[PDB]
Design a protein around this ligand. Sequence first.
Ligand SMILES: [Zn+2]
Length: 330
Amino acid sequence: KDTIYHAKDAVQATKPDMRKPRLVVFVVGETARADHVSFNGYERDTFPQLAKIDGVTNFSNVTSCGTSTAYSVPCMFSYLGADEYDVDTAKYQENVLDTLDRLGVSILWRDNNSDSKGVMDKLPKAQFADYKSATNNAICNTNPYNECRDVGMLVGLDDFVAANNGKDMLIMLHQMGNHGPAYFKRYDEKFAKFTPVCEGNELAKCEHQSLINAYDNALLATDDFIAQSIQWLQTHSNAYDVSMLYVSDHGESLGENGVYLHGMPNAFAPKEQRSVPAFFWTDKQTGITPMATDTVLTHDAITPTLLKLFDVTADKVKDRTAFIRLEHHH
Ligand SMILES: [Zn+2]
């Protein structure tokens, strides 16, 4: 059925022929809990590599719109926001990627998780790529599970940049991340830092600490992946204004009250399934300023953040809080 406009008024204020083109990576995370992030108070150093990079802002109060991939991911790109979002018609609404594409931003979505849950469906098929495949993903033979790794989504991104030379570009990288129940499969051996590790599929039967250890090892691999995504962006910082946004789709229960995994209806899902990390990084020269770390934020902040990163105004989100500020220091 027809696309419902939400941002027919949208205007891009500046074009990449008159200022530096902009190149952004949005890491769409998976199953990561805010309270297992070092920066949020967790006693283990689960993000050591991000800790070494200047310009990373950690957001300590971010709540997901839902508890599953199918519910959260479309809402993350929505104009409706969590309070009026309808998962069953999301696919036919104009979303933020539709707006950016029709204003001239080149969109790419690589997926090592599942798929875009309808978000990419109106855009050309070539702009979505399945990186769960060992033909597309060159980093699947580093572990005994033969599991394709998130970092494999960075291979060959330079081909995309070259094919879109001088244009604005937004690249979504959809992580496997911390998906369970088999946390121990989610990371290569170099990240097996917390030990012993639950390597059984029935989580209630593992010793609790061993379950936490596997989960935290998987976060170390995500810390690595985000750090390498920033390092990749940094190779383009002379020609492009580069930024990286990370937000997880939802959190995870880890045995509290005997609850495991996620997906529970929002009305009674525990807070562990809704409190998510978010990080924002930008190069010094972009002029983008992050919001305060402790801003009360939700998935509703993503769409206005993506629009602002490309200098796009849309009436529908004019009052929303974003991850980045409206005011610019000169
Ligand atoms: Zn998920």
